[model samples]
Structure formats: C-alpha cells, structure tokens
Target chain A: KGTRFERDLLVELWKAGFAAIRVAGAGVSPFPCPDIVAGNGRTYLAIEVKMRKELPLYLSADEVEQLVTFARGFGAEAYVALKLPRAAWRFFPVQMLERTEKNFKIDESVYPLGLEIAEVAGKFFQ
Target chain B: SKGTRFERDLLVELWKAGFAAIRVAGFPCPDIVAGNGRTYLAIEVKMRKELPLYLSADEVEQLVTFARGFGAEAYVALKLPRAAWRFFPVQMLERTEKNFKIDESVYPLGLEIAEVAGKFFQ
Candidate 1:
C-alpha cells in the first residue's frame, strides 16, 4: 500500500538525518502535490513515491506536472521514487524521465539511471 | 490593504524570525515559504480592518497541499489593524460548507510570532 511505503520511507529519511513527512491528499485534491517532502537541512526534496513489483512503471503527465509544480513552489528539487522487487529504492529527477504524450514511462530499460537512496540523501561524498 | 502587500510583510516577519523566507509566486500556492535550517513553514496571509476574515475552501486546500508536499507546517497568518500578526494552524479555523472563517472570538487561539518560531526570548 502507498501509505505503508511512504511511512517506511519517512523512517528511512529520519534515520538518514533528514526531516520528512508523508503528505495527505494522496491524489485527492484538485491541486497538485507530491506524496512526500523531505530535507536534510541542506538539501530539500519533493518526491512522488511509487512501489512496483515488476517492470513498466508509468506516471501520468499530471503527476509529473504536480510534482514539478509543488517543487518549484516550495523551492525544492522534485523526484520520483521507485521501490521494485529485490531492489532497493531509487530516485530519479522529474527532468530525467522519458516523457511521452500521455505519461512518463520507466521500465528495465531505464531503471538503472536512478540514484540510490544514499545519493539522494546527500550521504555520498562528492 | 491588498493581500500582496500583507504577503510581503509576512515575508519580512519570517526573515526577522531567523528564517530564510520567500514570497512564493503563482496562484494556488502559499504566500510565503520559509525555513530556519531545522523547520519549514508555508503561510497564507490574510488581513482585514475588522472581524470575520474568510477563506475559501479551495484556498485553504491549496495551502495544505503545498505545505504537506514540502513537509512544512501550514498556517493562516492574520493581520488586524493595530495588532501584531497572529498565526493559527490551518486546522484551527472554523470550517463552513465552502469556506473557513476567523473572527475576533478566535483571537485567543492564535499564536504570536515568537511562539511560532520558538525564539526571541522575552
């Protein structure tokens, strides 16, 4: 369930020394908003969290639009987080997604392009 | 007198409270966004010369959405003539069918700026 996934992600963020919250209005409001927002006092992120058991994760254009809009409004970076079977969580910036006429598509072909949780949390030294 | 002016004033107050704050742009967005390294706030500014300040449901929902998405605490900051600003958590407002209302009766429920920021020992 999305609620469970977001709750777990929230704990991971806190353990990584970041303050994070799972947003209400899980695609219920008329406006656009991300599922989770987090920051480590230095790097702020607005994320749309998704859990998939298999390949071909698809996101509607509206979803991408809402995430980007909220990110821009809140002065944070926007990301799409994916949790797949037998794999750890990965995050990709909205700008990096492969856009289509109706949605943004992510499959095995582009899965490896995402950053690991440590990288997104600013734990990886440059 | 205008919301834009009040928004700018609130931006200044956020800065004075030791927050890095901005007046966010565009419609359906919070008037101000601020962070003090440890905390984040999304604020909607409202002002009136007298009682019965009103907010449409859509307006309140927009603020909540952005605040939730940014992991910020959402507030409705009220400005009245000759009174220092008072902040109220969004849920504190009295809800009606299509709007939310804040009046003098609820003034005691509001928090002062220092209370909101937890600073400026006095």
Candidate 2:
C-alpha cells in the first residue's frame, strides 16, 4: 500500500538530485528496489520506502532471498525507508551479500527493521 | 434480465457517444477503454447481494496499498443496475499509514455493476 510518507520520500529524493520512476500494476517484477532509480555510471542507489506505525508480519523468507539475490547480482545498493509517527523515519541497510536464515520468525525481523529505521531517522546508506 | 438490458443500453449509448464497447466472457473485472482518446475507465460492477469481498480480496487491498504507497489515485467505480445513471462510491479504499491495512468505506445499498459488466463485457 502507498502511504503519504512513501510519496513524500520519493519527492524528497527527487528534489535531492535523484532520478525517480514510478511503475504501476503487476509490473514490479525485479522487486525490492527503490521506486526511483537514480545516479549516473557505476554509482547507483535503490531505495524502498515503507511507512508503518508498527511493522506487520509480511515479506516472506523467499522474498527476502530474492531481494538479496537481485541486489548482489545487479551490484546495486538497497535501502528500505520506514516512516514513523512524529515526523520521523528509520533506515535499514540491506545485506545483499549475506545469507542468513537465522530467525525465521516474521514479526521479529520486520518490526526490528521499523524500529531501526526510526532510530536512524531514515538515513540509510550502502 | 434487467441487468442485461441495462448493459445493452449502455453499450448503445456508448456507441452513440462515439465510443466502442466490446463484450467478453469469463473475465473477472470491469473496465472501459475509449479508443478515440476520450478516456478509459476500469469499472467494477456488482449487485446488492455481493459483498466487498466478492472482488479480489488481496489485489484490491494491494491496489489501495500501491496507491497509498505511491500516492496515486486508484479509483473503484460502483454502479447499481436500478440506479443506472448514478455512480455510487462504494468506498474510497486506501492503504493505511502502515501500508498493511485496507481502509474501506462501503455504501450498503450500492452494487458494483460496472465491475460485473467489465468482467465479461470486455
């Protein structure tokens, strides 16, 4: 679902000299990347924005594997921006190169990421 | 049936209005494509007997989610057969701030006729 923060973040990134592209309907095949892809030649940034008061149990293990695989294969840096209440955000560094199935619980990883993003004020860099 | 008559009349009106409407079968959604650069609409028609859950539970949720996530307009049009001229706003469904919940406001008397017609009336 799209949220105000997601749209605002996209606009904010665009204002920050990043090129962004919006895709509609069943076309997000190479998933878990920035909605807008920006940068020139060799240097690229992929960002995914999520706004949640509290994270839900979504994003399966298979999905995570696909995201990491795609990121490493493309040699692209990925970030997920989480928007919290009170005009704050949290940023999570995506581990593109790591293979971890450590905690298979859904809510555990998801909520922590939200909390992490809020803690960092949504400034995540790879 | 009254529904079929309305469909035929609507098609005739569309034709007279310089628009071409095609009918298809077995498809599960309602939408209109005006070939002459007028405007295209995806309609979801229903009857009073149908619930909001009759449509794509997840995808409808996903549409609102995507719209909210990207901040775009995802419109779902509901038209009742009896009130053919009037379009009812079943709900301005959208994604919650968490991007997890679907916020839907239903109009109890409404039927999503466009949705049903668009399903077979391609």
Candidate 3:
C-alpha cells in the first residue's frame, strides 16, 4: 500500500511536468534517501510519501532527519506527503513539520495546514 | 527469484563502479536508481535466455519519464548466461507497434560496466 501511493504521486508529478523516481520502500540501503525524487530541470524535490487510513501519522525523528539530510546533500527540497482514505494528497515541508522528541507527528489538525498537491505543484512547477 | 537475483547482481556492479545504487522495490519501470556524487542513472534490468529481449512501449515511456524527471541517464541492462552484462541507452533501441526490442543486430553495441563508468569516471 505504501508503494502504491508512491506510484500514485509519481503519476501526479508527471502530469504536472515533473520527472520523478521512486526509491525503494524503507530504502534498506547503505545510505539515506527519500521515497521519491523529482525534478523539472529548474526545480528538484525529494519526498517522503506516506498514507494513513486515519489521522495522526507518526514518523520516527531519525527517519525524518534522514530525509532532511539526504535532501540537503541531493540538492532538492524535502517534503512529506500524506494521503488520507478519500482526501487528496497534502504536503508539508520538513522544515515546517512539528517535532516531538522521539518522532515527527502529523495529525488532522496539522495536515490541514499543508499544501495540497495542486498548491505544491503551482509553487514548484509554475 | 531469477529476476530479483539479476537485479541485485546489477546493483552490486553499480556500487563497485562507484555509484550508490538501489533496486527499486515493487516497480517495473525502473529496476534500479544509482548516482555517483556527480551523475545519476535510471535502469530497467532484463535477464533472458538469449537475444531478442522485448519491452512494452509503456515501460520504455515510464523509464524515460523517470530518467528525465530525475536528471539521470536511462538504460536497459541485459544479462544472459555466460555473457557479461550489456547496457543500452534507451534511445538506441528499435521501436515497433507497441514495444521495443533488443536482438542480435544491436547486441554488439551494448557496453560493459567499465565502459559505462568511463563516461562519468576513469
């Protein structure tokens, strides 16, 4: 299901004229990387994709920090995108997410403040 | 199992060649994504008993899309028994009604990993 959302977002980015690639789930590699990386020659993005049936998705701080560092090195902006059961995708930049000592938390209250995919597309693609 | 083994083998080769590589999980368009500190690559890995490895047109489209989106070189890597791997630039493939094919004619054109590495390194 996690993999499914990555592809879904990949298609969304494509229609918006961005080239995107999905990194392996959980990325079990020797290095830190994001779930998806995309660009349009002028803009580049590294995204951590997640889906939840309900709100209050919690991601380990280690994982969130890994994405931030990877994006820094990869020269791409870092984003965390969450998809609810029936709602559209919402995106939050890592710098904007709330942090607990142990994890990064995104509940319905917080996610509503996020950029919808369209809004994000307009900012990055326009 | 055979398909995955081939993909892993390719990943090892890419790492040895100095690219930080990963096998894309649960996807067909690009089996691997790798980058040195400088260049990036999006690859579709294929293992066949012999020549004439055929690829769907949609798969090629996806590969090219991802490569362009990620600013990486796109390649189709073929591995056959007793033969070292061969990498073909996606643009070099022959197109047909609904597919792309790699057969005997272009077999000689595929480059070894060392040759590919030369493009970005020594």
Candidate 4:
C-alpha cells in the first residue's frame, strides 16, 4: 500500500498495543523502501505491502541493489506483504531472497516479528 | 480438521480414542467431546499460548447445570504438545435451587456443588 495508507493502519494497530515502527521515506533513493517495520523484542521485521493485483517479478536493478545493501547492513528479519484481489494477502518471509542473488542472502539470526492487521476496520490498499 | 496444526492434532487424538469429537468454529470458545454410556465430556483446546484459567460465575453455573442435566462430567482439558493432559474437573455446581431451598441438583450427581458463587480466589 501507499505510505499514507500504511501509516494510518500502523497507527491504529499501534494504539491497540501492537509494537509498530514506520520506515521513513525521506533521504532514501528511489523514494520508497520498506513500508512498515515492527518487532517484538526478539526479532525485527521489515514489511512491504503491495496494494495491487500483481507485483513486478524483478525489482529494478537499483531497487534490488538497495534492498540487498540495506539487508546486509541491518541484520534484521524482513518480509514483503502482497495484497491481492478477492481479499487475499500473502506474507513472504525474507528467506525468499535466496532465489534472487548470492549477495541477497537473508540473515537467519533475525526472527519474524509477528504482527496482525486484521483488527483494522478496512482492508489496506496501495 | 480445520484449525491450526495443534488444534487439529488434539481433535485427532480424541477421535482415535473412540470419542465422537467435532471442531467448533470461531474464537472465544472451546473444543472436542468424549461421551460414554450416560456420561458426556466437553473439552476446550488451546495451543502454544499460555493463559490463566478463569471462568465467569454464570458460566460455571451453566456448566454445573449441564452436568446435572446430563448426569455427565465437564472438564477444561489443557493439552501441551508432547506433555500430559492437564484436566480441570468441574467438581461441583454451587447455586442453590430456590424452590427446593437446597444446593442444586448436582448433589444427586455425586459431584460437590457449593452455594457461595463468586470469583475463584486463586
């Protein structure tokens, strides 16, 4: 979803006792990076929710490079959330990065920070 | 067959034991059943999450009534993976029957029913 939508939903979930941290967009190249980040004390998670029917199979060379660089720099759990038609959503753990490139390897030290947005009133959109 | 893996496993065990069990849909409720002869067993299954056991006075009363009516047993079966089942027996139905001016029918069922209804001080 877009930043505004993500921001609104994250705020609401936070108020309900969820530990949510939004990724700031400024000073980052290509404008958007990770959408919303959250964590329980044990693990840090990076989330990217797409509010569209289909997402591009491959990220732009810049995007991929940026993500890989960011992941390597920060040893934390990461994920991509895709919002599909028919009210379906998929959570992709950072392990999926293994398929992309060698340098894009995910760090196992980071654990998933389980967060649920179901309590939010409406489905989030990009 | 339709819950998280843990819940499904619990139901399967109950069924394998020759208990007629069914998975209840939705949340804030319990699960499973095992009945034999005149006694019926009702169970609530939880997985992974640890929660303090608490029951409302009204719920306790209804459970007692259910036990007395069926002359059966009621239990809160807390099952842990690879661990033994922790069974909390509904030992008594404590409300007084106003018309009879005595402790409820649970006495005849051979279960202890107390009359003073309040939060359990644990």
3 or 4: which has the higher lDDT?
Answer: 3
lDDT of 4 at A47: 58
lDDT of 1 by residue, A32-105 (tens): 56777666546798789999989778999888987787677556788998988777788888877897788998
The CA lDDT at B95 in model 4 is 33
Give per-candidate clash totals. Answer: 0, 23, 1, 4
TM-score computed on alpha carbons, candidate 3: 0.71
Q: Quote the positional error of residue A99 for candidate 2 in Å.
A: 9.7
What are the candidates' individual DockQ scores? 0.07, 0.02, 0.29, 0.01
Q: Report the lDDT tens digits of candidate 4 across residue range A23-79.
A: 433224232245554432333344555565443333344444454344333333446
Report the lDDT tens digits of candidate 3 across residue range B1-122: 88888988998788678665667766234888776656677899999998899999999988987787677889999999999999999988988888999989987899899888775534
Using DockQ as the measure, the top candidate is 3
Off by over 4 Å in 1: A123-126, B1-39, B42-85, B88-122
**Model 2, runs deviating above 4 Å:** A1-3, A26-36, A40-43, A55-58, A96-126, B1-122
* DockQ score for candidate 3: 0.29
Interface Cα root-mean-square deviation for all models = 9.8, 16.5, 3.4, 23.3
Give all TM-scores, in the order shown.
0.56, 0.35, 0.71, 0.32
Ordering by lDDT: 3, 1, 4, 2
RMSD of each: 10.7, 16.4, 4.1, 18.7
Better of 2 and 3 by lDDT: 3
DockQ-based CAPRI category assigned to the predicted complex of candidate 3 = acceptable
